[PDB]
């Protein structure tokens, strides 16, 4: 054939990949502490002899969007929201250290703090709270525990949440949705990120997802139009080859 | 030699028919959840290579083997499915629909081209037998 | 299941579940000692097609 069909076909398939990324972003429009994935087409030119005429296209995801999200006021002392460019630290699935923005902190029957089922990490490691005690979280992450039955004079600090500062260019979303330091950024900032004392959190507010609707809509419209354009090129190339095959007769 | 063109073009026709069959099978089973063994349907692909064993560089086309794709099987969340893993994820085929459609059309076009080559060579061999009346 | 009709179906189902939770909260306003429900959502596994 004329491999021009293999260019428009790639452009049509990567458009479906982009649509699958955008639809995934739209599905998580209500996920607490969600970071939308950025999608971008990139052109790769095929090198060779003689005339460079073919340039294929692939969909890539250049990190995520770190724009602080919406803040819903839920009058719950455990749901916290972070200052812009600030991350909470939890223990990842494989016993590693991961970063998140979901402040929906839950207390188990044994007293351990968890986020989405992952243990919460402080300066002393995972945080264990006295069993069945009221928890208040300060602006700088200090945790006060009140034991029921005892007077409010008993309120004393227990542990401090680990709050780190990381930009978009330094973190990469792992396969389980937890952000981790990229290789270059890890090599310069060390393996574990030191807690930043300047990070402030707000207790009683939960951060929503930063999925922008207007950009999503425009992206879907553009993707549909591009897919139709590639289909019209594919049809034209197929029609051309069908007659060109007549040259072999007689 | 015009006679070897028969073998060359027949090999090409058979190989392109196999490729189109693989593409049609992939298109049909793009939404299959399971197979007889309980394993997901993996997209199949043919392997084209020349067959010029008796000291030649060009000898036509033959399909060495049919191989299943190594691209990632699509994971869908479904905890009630008996085939779901520990996390509740079910594996689904990695078929590229647009790719298989383009494969169907391209296989048809090159199959037709080889048909035309065979017809032309047959006509030339028919005309040869009348050499000098 | 073209991987874009499944992803959006999942979102539609999630929004329907949230609406069911909201309707349950609103219907049980007059009950005694009723604690309101709140729906929490999490994105599933991220599939890596090609490494950076």
């Amino acid at each position: 054939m004329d491999h021009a069909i293999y260019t428009a076909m790639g452009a049509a398939s990567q458009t479906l990949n982009q649509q699958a990324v955008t639809a995934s972003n739209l599905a998580n429009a209500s996920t607490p502490g969600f970071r939308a994935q950025l999608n971008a087409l990139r052109a790769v030119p095929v090198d060779g002899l003689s005339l460079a005429t073919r340039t294929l296209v692939t969909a890539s995801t250049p990190g995520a969007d770190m724009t602080p999200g919406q803040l819903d006021y839920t009058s719950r002392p455990l749901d916290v929201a972070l200052q812009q460019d600030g991350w909470l630290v939890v223990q990842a699935a494989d016993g590693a250290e991961g970063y998140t923005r979901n402040g929906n902190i839950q207390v188990g029957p044994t007293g351990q703090l968890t986020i989405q089922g992952h243990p919460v990490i402080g300066e002393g490691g995972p945080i264990t709270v006295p069993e069945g005690s009221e928890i208040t979280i300060a602006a700088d992450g200090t945790i006060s525990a009140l034991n029921p039955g005892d007077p409010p004079n008993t309120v004393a600090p227990v542990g401090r949440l680990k709050l780190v500062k990381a930009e978009g260019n330094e973190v990469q979303r792992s396969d389980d949705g937890l952000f981790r330091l990229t290789a270059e950024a890890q090599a310069e900032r060390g393996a574990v990120l030191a807690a930043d004392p300047s990070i402030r959190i707000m207790s009683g507010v939960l951060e929503g997802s930063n999925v922008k609707p207007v950009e999503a809509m425009t992206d879907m419209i553009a993707n549909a139009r591009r897919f139709e354009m590639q289909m019209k090129v594919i049809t034209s190339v197929d029609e051309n080859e069908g007659r060109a095959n007549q040259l072999l007769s007689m | 030699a015009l006679l070897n063109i028969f073998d060359i073009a027949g090999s090409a026709l058979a190989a392109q028919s196999k490729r189109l069959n693989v593409a049609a099978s992939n298109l049909a089973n793009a939404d299959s959840v399971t197979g007889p063994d309980g394993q997901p349907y993996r997209a199949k692909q043919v392997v084209f290579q020349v067959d010029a064993a008796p000291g030649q560089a060009t000898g036509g086309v033959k399909v060495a083997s049919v191989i299943e794709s190594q691209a990632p099987e699509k994971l869908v969340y479904e905890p009630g499915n008996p085939l779901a893993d520990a996390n509740g994820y079910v594996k689904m085929p990695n078929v590229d629909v647009v790719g298989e459609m383009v494969n169907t059309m391209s296989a048809s076009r090159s199959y037709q081209a080889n048909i035309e080559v065979l017809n032309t060579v047959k006509s030339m061999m028919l005309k040869t037998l009348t050499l000098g009346q | 299941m073209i991987s874009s009709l499944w992803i959006a179906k999942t979102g539609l189902d999630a929004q329907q579940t949230n609406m069911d939770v909201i309707a349950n909260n609103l219907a049980n306003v007059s009950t005694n000692g009723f604690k309101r429900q709140r729906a929490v959502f999490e994105d599933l596994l991220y599939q890596t097609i090609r490494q950076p």
């Binding site: 293999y6 | 490729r19 020349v50 | -």
Partner: peptide, 16 residues
Amino acid sequence: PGGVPGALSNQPAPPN
């Protein structure tokens, strides 16, 4: 000497 004749060999891929 050859490979998959179509979509799976005409799309960009990371190197091995």
